[PDB]
Copies of this chain bind each other. A is one copy, B any other.
């Protein structure tokens, strides 16, 4: 028995209130599906401005977590999405990880008409049916008709 591993990428650890109120409900949503959630702010233990001697080790721990996970769950909220989440999203695409995006932000920050965001954030997703991997609410995370559930059971 080995549960699937999801790297939960988000900018929510940068804010004290967001870290304590927004991440735990998302973590619970994924693990009600049996997932082992790798949350980088708690794992790599970054709670304030990372010191000069600590910044490389945090980057390497996030680099290694992306290499050793099965899928990424990228909170792509904000205008624009957080640049650290994007670096790790591109690493997950190049390494053929399962890709899932989350944005409950109704603002559109896009360079095209087909996607709500920059089109490169969707390069790792199919041309038709990418919306199945695009979650717009925390309640939607556990939908048995969406891609994350079908990736665990399929």
Contacts and interface: CB of A to CB of B under 8 A. Distances in A.
B18 A106 contact: no
A114 to B, nearest CB: 4
A105 interface: yes
B62 A105 contact: no
A81 B120 CA distance: 14
Interface size class of A (residues with CB under 8 A): 35 or more
A15 B17 CA distance: 14
Most buried by B among A47, A111, A123: A111
Contacts of A98: none
Contacts of A93: 63, 87, 90-91, 94
A49 B118 contact: no
A143 interface: no
Given A16-B104, A111-B49, A112-B50, A123 B21 contact: no
A47 B105 CA distance: 10
Contacts of A54: 112
A81 B118 CA distance: 13
A13 B63 CA distance: 29
B86 A111 contact: no
Given A51-B113, A91-B94, A105 B14 contact: yes
Contacts of A34: none
